[PDB]
Each structure stands twice: as C-alpha cells, then as structure tokens.
Design an enzyme around this catalytic site. Sequence first.
Site, PDB file in Angstrom:
ATOM      1  N   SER A   1       0.827  -1.187   0.000  1.00 24.51           N
ATOM      2  CA  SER A   1       0.000   0.000   0.000  1.00 24.51           C
ATOM      3  C   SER A   1       0.864   1.241   0.000  1.00 24.51           C
ATOM      4  O   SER A   1       0.403   2.323   0.339  1.00 24.51           O
ATOM      5  CB  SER A   1      -0.935  -0.021   1.207  1.00 24.51           C
ATOM      6  OG  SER A   1      -0.209  -0.008   2.420  1.00 24.51           O
TER       7      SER A   1
ATOM      8  N   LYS B   1      -3.821   3.408   9.548  1.00 27.93           N
ATOM      9  CA  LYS B   1      -2.935   4.371   8.916  1.00 27.93           C
ATOM     10  C   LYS B   1      -3.116   5.742   9.539  1.00 27.93           C
ATOM     11  O   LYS B   1      -2.132   6.456   9.781  1.00 27.93           O
ATOM     12  CB  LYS B   1      -3.197   4.461   7.430  1.00 27.93           C
ATOM     13  CG  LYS B   1      -3.364   3.169   6.712  1.00 27.93           C
ATOM     14  CD  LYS B   1      -2.177   2.321   6.775  1.00 27.93           C
ATOM     15  CE  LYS B   1      -2.264   1.230   5.757  1.00 27.93           C
ATOM     16  NZ  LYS B   1      -2.122   1.836   4.423  1.00 27.93           N
TER      17      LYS B   1
END
Lengths: 50, 50, 248, 278, 50, 50, 99
Positions: free
Chosen positions: D182, D225
Amino acid sequence: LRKKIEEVGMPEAVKTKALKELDRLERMQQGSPEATVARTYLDWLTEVPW
Amino acid sequence: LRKKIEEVGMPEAVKTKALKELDRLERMQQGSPEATVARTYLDWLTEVPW
Amino acid sequence: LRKKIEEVGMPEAVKTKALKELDRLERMQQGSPEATVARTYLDWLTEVPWSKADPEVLDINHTRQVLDEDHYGLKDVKERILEYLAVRQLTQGLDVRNKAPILVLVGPPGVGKTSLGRSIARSMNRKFHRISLGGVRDEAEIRGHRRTYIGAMPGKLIHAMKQVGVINPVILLDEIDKMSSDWRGDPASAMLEVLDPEQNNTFTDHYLDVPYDLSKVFFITTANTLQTIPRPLLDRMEVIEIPGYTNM
Amino acid sequence: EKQAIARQYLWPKQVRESGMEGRIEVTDAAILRVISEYTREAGVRGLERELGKIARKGAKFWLEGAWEGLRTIDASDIPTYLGIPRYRPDKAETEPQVGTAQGLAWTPVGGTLLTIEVAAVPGSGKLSLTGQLGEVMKESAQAALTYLRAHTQDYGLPEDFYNKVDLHVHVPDGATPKDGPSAGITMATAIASALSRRPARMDIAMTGEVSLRGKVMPIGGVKEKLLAAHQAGIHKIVLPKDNEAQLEELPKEVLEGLEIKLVEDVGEVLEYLLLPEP
Amino acid sequence: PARMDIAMTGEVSLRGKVMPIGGVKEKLLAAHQAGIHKIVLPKDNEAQLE
Amino acid sequence: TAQGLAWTPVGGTLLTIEVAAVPGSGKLSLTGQLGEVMKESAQAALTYLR
Amino acid sequence: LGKIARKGAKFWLEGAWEGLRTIDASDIPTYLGIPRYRPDKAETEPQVGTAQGLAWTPVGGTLLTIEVAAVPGSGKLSLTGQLGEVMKESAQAALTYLR
C-alpha cells in the site's frame, strides 16, 4: 464387560480377541495401565457396530 | 487428604480416582516419585476448584 | 537437634517446619531417607538465626560517603543507585515495600561489581553474601531440590541465611545470564516471583516446604551480557549500564 | 487521549507509587511534553515508565532537601528529571528531503513511518531492489515509472531517461509487514523526487495504491494508517478518493488533528508533496 | 593513503547521510582503550557528549 | 585498509577492513563471514560512490 | 446475516421499540457497515484503458481487468503481474492480428 461382547453380534474373528482380553484380567489400574487399556480397547470392540 | 477428599467437593468419578490415589499410596512417603507423584497429584486434584 | 528449635529464635513458619522435620527424626539416621533429609533440613533451617536485623541505613548521605571510598563514584552509576535508594527513604504507606525492581547490573568484564555489592553492604550497613548462580546445572545451587528423601540438595541461599544471623542481607546474584537448570522450568520464575515485595514472604523452594519468609530483604543482581536474559527477567529487573575504565 | 489517560488514571498511579502524595503537581504541557518528546510507542507503556522516573527524581530532590510540599513541574524544566529529548519534539521541522518519501504503514507492533529512500544514479536503465525487496515494490515502482513515462513533459525529465538512469531503491522492512503493498504513492513520491532531483515535503505523510492508467485505487484499514500518523507525529495525511466511505465511521476524537487532501489521480498527490515539482 | 590514529563509527544512507548511533559512551570505552586520539562521530550524538 | 571500532559485550575489541580492489566487473566479493547488513551498506557504499 | 442478527439484539435490548419488527431495503446500513460492494459494475463510465475478462480461480471464478499501458518508446513487450510466457504468446498473437 462380558455381556456387552455377547449382545453385539460379532464375527468370531472379533470374539477370539474379545475372550483374549477377557483372559488378560485381574491386574492393576491404579499402579499401571494394565487393565485400563485392556478394558477400554475391549469397549471399543464392543461399541462399534457389527 | 482422606479428610479432604470428602471436603474437596468433586464429581463422582473424580472422587473415585482420588480414593484410588489413596489406595495406591499408604505405603510410600519417603519415596522417590512413588510417594511424591501420587502426593502432588492428590494435592492438585484437591486444589482445583470444583 | 530437638533442643535446637527453641534454642534458636525463629519466625512462626520456620519454627513450625522445624518442629515438623524434628518429628520425622528419631530412628536410624544412617539410612532410611526420611530421617536423614529431615536432619539436613533441621540443620539448614534451625542454624539460621532470626528475630534480629542488620542496621538498615536510612541515610543516603552515609551511603554517598561509604560507596565513594572503594572506587570513586564514576559520575553516573552512583546516582542511579542513589535514586533507587531515594525511594527507599520514601516507602509508600510507611511500610518498607518494594513494588519495584532490584537493580540488575551489566557492564564490561572486569569492573568492580564485587566492590559495588560489598560496598553497598557497608553503606546499607548490612551483611554481604553471594551464592551460586553463574553457570548452574540444576535448581540446587539456585533453588531447592525436593525432599522426603536425601539426594535433595539444600539452598545456597539457605547457606547464606545459616551464615548470617539477621533478616536483611544483600544477596548478590552473579551472572544470571548463564543461569541454567536441569529442572523443567526456569529458576527465572523464582527470580521474578521473589522480587515482587510480598512474594518472598510466602516463598519456598523444592527444598523449602512451609513459607520460609525471605520478606524483609533487598536483593541485587549482576551479569555481563547486554542482549540475552529471560523475558520474565525484564520485569522486576532494573538494568543499570556499567562502563569500563579509562586511563586516569 | 493519552494526556487524558494520564491525568485521570496514570499520573496519580505514579505519585502513589513513589509516596509523594500531596507533594508534586503536574501541568498540561508537562504531560504533553513527556508525550511528544520521550516516547514514540503505540500504547501507554512508555508513559508509565517516564512518569515513574519523574516520581523517583521527585523522591530524591525532595529527599536530601525537603522544602516544598507543592512541587509544580511545568514544560520548561523536565530535563532536570529526565534529560535530553530522545526524539524530535516536533516533526513539523524536518526540512524537505530529497529521496525521502514518508511512508505510512503498520508494523504490527505499532505504527511507523517507513521512509523509503531512493537514489538515482547515472547509468544504463535498470532497477535495483535493496532493503531486501520482493517483487512487489519493484512492480509498483515499475507502474509508477510507466505512469511517469506517460507524463514526462511535466516533471522536467528528458523523454528517454528510462534507458540511461539505473535505479537504486532502499526500503526498510523490504516486504509488506501489514501484508499489503500500500506504499504506492509513497514510491511514486520517492521516485519522482529521486528522478526529479527535488526534495519531497516533510510533515505530510501519504499512503495509497497506484495503477497503470494513473489511478490512486483504494486501501484497506484506513483507521490504523490514520493512527500511525497520529502517534508518530505527522499531521497531514493523503488518502484515496474512494475512502470517503470508511472515513465517516471514525470516532471524532481520532479526526481532530488531521488535514486530508483526498486524491484519485496521482497528479494530485504529486502536486502536494513536492515543492520544486519538476 | 588514508590517515593514521583517526578512527570512526557511523551509519551511511543510500543518499549518503550519517544516521546517528546508539551506545556512544560504550564505543568510547572499547575504543579509547585503543588510544586512538581523534574519533569522528555522527553530528546527532552530541546529545551523548554532554 | 581501515580500522573498525566496535563494542562487543565480551569486553571491548576492534576490527580492520581489508579491501582487494581486484580487476573485475562490478561483481562484489565479500569474505570473513561478512553479514548481510554489511553487504547492504556495501551496496550503499558503492552506490554513494557512484 | 450474523451481523444483522447480533446488532438486532443490541438495538432491541437497549429498550424494545416494539413486539414485532421489520427491515426492508435501505434499513440495512443502520444494521450493517457501509455497503462494501457497490451495485452492478455497469454504473461505471466506460474506461479508456481496459476490458474485463471472466476467469477461473480454483475457489471459483471472478473478474480481472487486464490493464495495458502503451508507453511511447522503443518497441518491446514487458509483462508485469509476473506472467508466464503464455501471456507473451497471446499478447504477441493479438498484436500480430492488429499488425
């Protein structure tokens, strides 16, 4: 233990060793697995269908 | 311990096995494990909460 | 040895287990393993004096003087010790309870760890000991070896107690990084247990049966490797970095 | 939330540890100073040890001389008790860097900032995969390259760099620790800064996923995140357009520092992290 | 030719930057036994000079 | 040839680096059980040099 | 259906709004999350790049938009996705037709 063997209709190729663990008796369970494994394997022999 | 097997509330077969621990002892209390193995096993199944 | 139990002052639990191992005696004492191991536990217990202490210092200033006379303080390692002892003058609830680690020591091989520990024992006004830890084969120089038969090895801690008379020594724990045991289970468990402040009061070994109260006693530890230690020995183990020495 | 954990339950635990009840007192920016300076963890272990050491230095400095029973420790003198800042007090200070793309990820013992650095040599046209890469970062880098080769008029690059610039790429933790590649717009930023020879902005972390038409496709686990950016001291986060939907289930404490510049075409993350863009 | 009696410890980057080091004073313990009189360090561990 | 400072927890010690820049092709040769992180910092070394 | 069921037990035992209840369409995202997969993939403004194969998967089929990036340059054929050769065969075959 003896009647459970003789109310299941087993092959005599079973009932030979059934009477064998009927012969192996008169020993300890509290000191050793000697009649434990005997009686419990023999009850496996009883409670499977024939 | 023979006082406690009553006192330690337990299930039936567990009480039975505890008396069998009682019967395999009463001959070994100096012993290399033959005392201590059944002594600590009696002490465990007294001090597990039922 | 029957007179010995009321000849030597005891706590209640040490008194009672001494009476117990008195009772298993008075037969053949050359074989018959209940009798001989009862005699050993009766000797290793009852010849430990009790009901008396070293002077526990309540003075860091005394302590800062005494420690600065064997090597000369070394500008960092002294004042970490003075911090630990500073909360020792500020014990919570007015009982001297730890709730804290015991200042495990690592440094280079050769710096004055012995000088540190014995110097502490002077500054804490206590009786120094060091027992067998560094490279032990089984919990018989560390912990107890189990009784009701001889072949059971006594505690070297119990030897330090039979050598001391009092209830607060400075037990050095040397090179715990190589502490091994033939016994299934770490003695590091008995380390992390006993260093919590109320677990030594009820503490036993395989050699100890009734709680041999190790309650009132500060402990100390040294080793010499920066990486390897049991994971339970990173709680209640206060690692203090010791440096080597330079030319002045 | 860490500060409120402190003043409600933590700091009274420590000044009951060291016996100093009714002796020491502690401010707002005191706890906030210990937080933004002397730990970068992902829980509250380090804060309880640091409040332990404040408690012990309080024991000694009250001990050898005992004048005050009302000790106020404010955010100007805590180095008396603890010392040097082990970290930046501010990560709003870190001065636009060349090959540095601030990654966001989740090392599964706590949020990180996986700063990929990428070095652009002169040479023959070849990608090197240092930091123990799998294929995954190579192919996302290859995707970023193909996007960039679709758009070389912008970034000042001559039209045929790919035959004459070998690439040397450094990735700490060179496989995906979350099990997810990612770091797409991470490596897009890193490579466009590395080949553009121009510094990538600090203080704006980013995370995403790129694909060959130039698309910032969506990611998984948006909360973690955002928390890694919230622990490790970053403020602006750059997220895909296709996560308006995950975003509004967030408990509104989490959202109260962050300043999101939502993207879907990679030209829009790359108009934000570079100050000298070509 | 390099120099003499000047030693060093330090981490380089793929950009070529000195990323700072841990255990500074320990390195000076092991190194300043070897008497090397001028040791070069990362800029950021002035924090452990003090 | 360049001398290497280290701590080692056995007591302090040192190292020396020995480099044989042989006629070859760019193909890096490492000897002395040189660890992978030394290999990567060698990559970073030669890369910084490039 | 489990997540609907357990949150049904929640919204019940805070205090029962009724004796018998009903859920129809768009009384779901209360009881569930955000709707994960958007409706029919027809809605999606046909893409300049790529069409979408059906495909086998050994745990049963799915779709696979096979993106192709015509990048102006040398004259080659890469294949990302770490393909076998078999795609390079098929790519070169389709390319031959177009030639």
